């Protein structure tokens, strides 16, 4: 089953050395924007779960919708943390450890937020033979670009301070090289219905 808008709940794994799972929780940044932390995490738990929602300002996905909408590279989506309902978010705020990159946070909901909540998928590799323009669990590698800031979601390899449970720093990288695997991700788990 290809990944769908709204109904697909996924975990998302980073492909650099020591890369792990995109993660959030209710604790906030002590400096920076003071918004909700986003990290990478080395174990499997429900705080690794995300789903894709429509771009800011369009109708939120509803289970009452009858048609399935498969994710498309190049389309703007929000990436929503399932346990907290916050949107993956960035902005021109320095990251907590990689001070030359941008902080990535969880922000707002279906009402609260703005166009900095819009992200765009770019497929970098398909090892399978399925539709090369769709996302497939495990076998599709992709980058996740913030549309407004132009930067790429990345796990830097830095550990956070104790205030982030010593989890892995996530930033939005400015002008990375295309093959930088800190910016490459895959769907690691997929549950739908």
Residue numbers in the entry: 340 to 532
Sentences from the paper on this structure:
The high resolution of the Pmt2-MIR (1.6 Å) and Pmt3-MIR (1.9 Å) structures allowed for a detailed analysis of the respective structural properties and ligand interactions. In order to understand the role of PMT-MIR domains in protein O-mannosylation, we analyzed the Pmt2-MIR structure for specific surface properties. MIRm1 site α, which is directly adjacent to the conserved L361 of the core, is completed by residues Y380, D384, N386, F504, and Q506 forming the wall of the cavity. An almost identical arrangement is found for Pmt2-MIR site β in the MIRm1-MIRm2 interface. Both cavities are filled by ligands present in the crystallization solvent (glycerol in site α [also in Pmt3] and sulfate in site β). Although Pmt2-MIR displays a pseudo-threefold symmetry typical for the β-trefoil fold classified as Type C CBMs, the analogous site γ (the third binding site present in β-trefoils) is not present in MIRm3. However, on the surface of the β11-β12 loop a two-residue insertion is present, which is specific to the PMT2 family (including Pmt2, Pmt3, and Pmt6) and human POMTs. This loop forms a surface exposed ligand-binding site in Pmt2-MIR, from now on defined as PMT2 family-specific site δ. The three residues form a trident that has picked another glycerol ligand from the solvent via hydrogen-bonding to the arginine side chain and to the backbone amides within site δ.
PMTs are divided into three subfamilies (PMT1, PMT2, and PMT4) and form functional dimers either within or across subfamilies (Akasaka-Manya et al., 2006; Girrbach and Strahl, 2003). In these structures each subunit has 11 transmembrane helices (TMHs) and two large hydrophilic loops oriented towards the ER lumen (LL): loop LL1 between TMH1 and 2 harboring a catalytic DE motif, and loop LL4 between TMH7 and 8, encompassing a so-called MIR domain, whose function remains unknown. MIR domains have a β-trefoil fold consisting of six β-hairpins arranged within a pseudo-threefold symmetry.
